[PDB]
């Protein structure tokens, strides 16, 4: 008898992406599922006896030394913004991306992007720091939202004002990121200040640049050049151990560094 899609379905829960099993060689579902749940149990047992580190925090910490090392300020940013940081960002009632956030009170939402916060501490440091100003924070965002996209996720975005805020300096930083994380990639944009550049494994993007200045600026008290960029965590996971599905890479009760908790 042939799989049901429901069984296979099942299957597909406890595969990981190198598994070398074969779904069609006349084995009854019960001994596959069988042979994958004493894998994934096995997954399990080694983490919990060597390295004992989730993916998703340790991502954070290997970005986090990066940034830190070459001369980037860490932030510790509110994860809970005001609704005002929305507008002031040019997202008005009417927009789609209106619709994605996440409301709390009369005055609140979770934070959907970093830009508000690192806006804010950019105006705020260049009273302080020499030029150029160079910030970064990773951590929670939020959009009610497939097999890409995550309600909640986690951002990492680099930020720098002043001097050196060009086009090369940022798809180089880019570049050494991404090849320091051993994650294939092209950089995409309109060749011809202003630019948006998209940062693609395949069909996937990984990330949105932006070389200022840009209007929306001066909404925030900045009026330097800058550039900078956000990349999504779970989807540099999920490229990085070839995930299927995104919600593997994600914060969850499902799934722990991609092996299924449903054993
Ligand atoms: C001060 C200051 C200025 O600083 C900056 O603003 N500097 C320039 C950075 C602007 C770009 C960026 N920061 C941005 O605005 O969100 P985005 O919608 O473009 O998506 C960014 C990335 O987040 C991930 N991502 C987004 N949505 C999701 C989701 N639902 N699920 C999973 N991953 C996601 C995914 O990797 C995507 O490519
Ligand atoms: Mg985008």
Redesign the pocket.
């Known amino acids: 008898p042939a799989l049901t899609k429901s069984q296979t379905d099942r299957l597909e829960v406890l595969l990981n992406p190198k598994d070398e099993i074969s779904l069609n060689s006349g084995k009854p579902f019960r001994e596959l599922e069988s042979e994958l749940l004493s894998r994934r149990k096995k997954d399990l047992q080694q983490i919990y006896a060597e390295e004992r580190e989730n993916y998703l925090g340790k991502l954070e910490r290997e970005i986090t030394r990066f940034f830190v090392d070459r001369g980037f300020l860490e932030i510790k940013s509110p994860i809970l913004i005001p609704l005002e940081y929305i507008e002031r960002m040019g997202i008005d009632n009417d927009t789609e991306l209106s619709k994605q956030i996440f409301r709390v009170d009369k005055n609140f939402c979770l934070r959907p ?3 508000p916060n ?2 804010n501490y ?1 105006r705020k440091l260049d009273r302080a720091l020499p030029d150029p100003i160079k910030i970064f924070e990773i951590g929670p965002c939020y ?1 009610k ?1 497939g097999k890409e ?3 909640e ?1 986690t ?1 990492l ?1 680099f ?1 720098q004002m002043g001097s050196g805020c060009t086009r090369e300096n940022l798809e180089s930083i880019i570049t050494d990121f991404l090849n320091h994380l051993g994650i294939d990639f092209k950089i995409v944009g309109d060749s011809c200040y202003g630019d948006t550049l998209d940062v693609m494994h395949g069909d996937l ?6 070389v200022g200045p840009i209007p929306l600026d001066r909404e925030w008290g900045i009026d330097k050049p800058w550039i ?5 965590l ?2 540099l996971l999920k490229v990085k151990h070839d995930f299927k599905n ?1 919600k593997r890479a994600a914060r969850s009760e499902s799934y722990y560094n991609g092996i299924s908790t449903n054993l």
């Open positions: 992007m970093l830009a690192l806006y950019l959009r939202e996209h995550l309600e996720f951002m975005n930020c993007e990984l990330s949105s640049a932006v900078g960029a956000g990349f999504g779970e989807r995104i």
